[PDB]
């Protein structure tokens, strides 16, 4: 076929990523830890972060083989964060994607350890499976992944989110600070690691970072819009529409997507798939 | 002073390591996560793994400045492992080194996350603070650290240790398999990362791996001897072998560790002495 079909693009990339994730975890002694990591890693989902990494790598002149190990590592980090998030000490969720959570299947101890194992493996896998990368670029990917996961990124965001729970003084600024850390850091890492592997300039990286921060926040604002309008069709937690109103929330979500698209215009037409992904993810949230 | 004094050597290396760990974590928002990571990282202790890393790097022709960031990363990883091990889902310890455990101070949620934050920071720190390393050697250190922590190392060891509880078929070989994963991988990583940074040969690295595996197992045998002589169900070296055979095995392992490093010449004397010193202090701190 000759016509770019975004749904098909995303389906093909998801298939490549899921085959690589499956192959990445060969069961060995002790089999339980591999089974528990695979239970969460291979559970499906959109695979957005690996897809963003591959797509940004290609945009900057790299190839899928260069990006794929780091793409897998990003999904291992994402997966670890969900395993830890679901625990009884954290969100205490029995189900995820309509299936029992890792700790409800294997125990809290095994779930904690499966998350730790996935986070360690992300770093190992980037190095062992990208021997063709420029070594200084690969070291920059490792530094970015460490910074992204830790107290200045995802883990800091998880702490900011826990601190907000049940508070009565939440503002839009407080929510945005949570989101930039809890989801924005890892979305930024997904596009920036792909770009770094391909040798992108600082200027190119700054445009991709603006794209990633904007789509991350837009996705959160849209999720809040759909939550409050489902409640319209039907503990206390403030949301963008509860704090700002639905009109202002809708205008902010649209502005953020528009700014993400404008951020990538200077790449030229090569940026069209990343620009399309921004609008597509939002449109699918409204349809699903 | 002209006499090599191991205790003084260790005190000076511990002071360098502790100053670097303290400087590594500047409090920022959210303050609680930095407070929780600092609480466990800066709790003191022997700092064995960072000191092994610096000592092995120096043995192989490297220096403290080359090794120090990796040494700090090893102690961040060690610290994470203890935070997670203490949790109510795992050992459920209220105290460590006579002080409240991380989750008793900050809560289980913050403790889990402080562990995750320390493991992430280990990899960041190694890369950002070692610009003078050969980049391929530094990548080999990163791969070694990730393999050491995960399913083929420490986390696999933690799972093998849980699986051993309340079993009747544990053998000395099965117990040794637990220990080589749960503590041996990280002790081996401590000396091998220092050696890799310095450009050690494969032959040198194989000797340091033998040293590390032997001291790690000796430390575990000695811990079991001291526990049973002070006295969830778990077999131990003395419960499986008897005390006489356990004592002979602990001595043999220390002897083998010392012999493993003889071919380096007198430069290996500090590492050789650390093996005997750690055992001697365990008996004295019993
Ligand atoms: C780091 C992240 C994003 C963990 C999941 O976030 P939440 O607890 O808010 O969301 P669920 O996926 O549990 O609904
Ligand atoms: C990964 C490691 C080494 C955790 C410590 O071992 P255990 O639970 O057996 O050790 P302690 O609690 O006695 O410190
Ligand atoms: Mg949560
Ligand atoms: Mg949750
Ligand atoms: Mg929301
Ligand atoms: Mg365009
Ligand atoms: Mg334990
Ligand atoms: Mg023991
Ligand atoms: Mg000698």
PDB file of N, CA and C and ligand atoms in Angstrom, chain A residues 261 264-272 275, ligand 6:
ATOM      1  N   UNK A 261       2.307  20.406  18.196  1.00  0.00           N
ATOM      2  CA  UNK A 261       2.400  20.261  16.728  1.00  0.00           C
ATOM      3  C   UNK A 261       3.320  21.352  16.211  1.00  0.00           C
ATOM      4  N   UNK A 264       7.212  20.899  16.465  1.00  0.00           N
ATOM      5  CA  UNK A 264       7.925  19.991  15.565  1.00  0.00           C
ATOM      6  C   UNK A 264       7.919  20.500  14.112  1.00  0.00           C
ATOM      7  N   UNK A 265       7.195  21.554  13.795  1.00  0.00           N
ATOM      8  CA  UNK A 265       7.152  22.049  12.402  1.00  0.00           C
ATOM      9  C   UNK A 265       8.538  22.249  11.812  1.00  0.00           C
ATOM     10  N   UNK A 266       9.532  22.796  12.549  1.00  0.00           N
ATOM     11  CA  UNK A 266      10.832  23.050  11.950  1.00  0.00           C
ATOM     12  C   UNK A 266      11.558  21.803  11.509  1.00  0.00           C
ATOM     13  N   UNK A 267      11.166  20.599  11.900  1.00  0.00           N
ATOM     14  CA  UNK A 267      11.767  19.364  11.360  1.00  0.00           C
ATOM     15  C   UNK A 267      11.383  19.165   9.892  1.00  0.00           C
ATOM     16  N   UNK A 268      10.337  19.825   9.435  1.00  0.00           N
ATOM     17  CA  UNK A 268       9.790  19.551   8.126  1.00  0.00           C
ATOM     18  C   UNK A 268       8.809  18.388   8.140  1.00  0.00           C
ATOM     19  N   UNK A 269       8.428  17.884   6.961  1.00  0.00           N
ATOM     20  CA  UNK A 269       7.396  16.846   6.842  1.00  0.00           C
ATOM     21  C   UNK A 269       7.759  15.549   7.562  1.00  0.00           C
ATOM     22  N   UNK A 270       9.047  15.287   7.806  1.00  0.00           N
ATOM     23  CA  UNK A 270       9.457  14.080   8.554  1.00  0.00           C
ATOM     24  C   UNK A 270       8.769  14.022   9.929  1.00  0.00           C
ATOM     25  N   UNK A 271       8.380  15.156  10.495  1.00  0.00           N
ATOM     26  CA  UNK A 271       7.734  15.169  11.827  1.00  0.00           C
ATOM     27  C   UNK A 271       6.251  14.781  11.762  1.00  0.00           C
ATOM     28  N   UNK A 272       5.663  14.614  10.597  1.00  0.00           N
ATOM     29  CA  UNK A 272       4.194  14.395  10.494  1.00  0.00           C
ATOM     30  C   UNK A 272       3.731  13.216  11.332  1.00  0.00           C
ATOM     31  N   UNK A 275       3.509  14.384  14.942  1.00  0.00           N
ATOM     32  CA  UNK A 275       2.476  15.415  15.059  1.00  0.00           C
ATOM     33  C   UNK A 275       1.100  14.745  15.034  1.00  0.00           C
TER      34      UNK A 275
HETATM   35 MG1  LIG C   6       4.807  20.174   8.854  1.00  0.00          MG
END
